[PDB]
Amino acid sequence: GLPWYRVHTVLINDPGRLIAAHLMHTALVAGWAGSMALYELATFDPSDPVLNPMWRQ
């Protein structure tokens, strides 16, 4: 049996499922970006860019 640290090696000779794994990785990364922005928007105070700029928050 494949050891746990080698499971993804089943893509090496399988370009379509390789593409499908890359697509899934890209999905998760773009989803993170959307979710992170939404969290930031939900928590950001826009009311004082002088003394409470984004980098303090």
Partner 1 sequence: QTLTYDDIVGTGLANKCPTLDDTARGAYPIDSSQTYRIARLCLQPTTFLVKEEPKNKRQEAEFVPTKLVTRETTSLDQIQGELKVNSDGSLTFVEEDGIDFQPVTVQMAGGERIPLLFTVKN
The residues that touch partner 1, with contacts defined as CB under 8 A, are 46-48, 50-51
| DSSP one-letter code for 12 | T
* Cβ at position 13, least distance to ligand CLA in Å: 11
Q: Which residue, 7 or 54, is less far from ligand LHG as judged by CB? A: 7
Does residue 4 interact with ligand LHG by CB under 6 A?
A: yes
Burial 11-48 (b: 16+ CB within 10 A, else e): eeeeeeeeeeeeeeeeeeeeeeeeeeeeeeeeeeeeee
Q: Which residue, 5 or 55, is less far from ligand LHG as judged by CB? A: 5
| DSSP one-letter code for 3 | -
Q: What residue ranges bind ligand LHG (CB under 6 A)?
A: 3-5
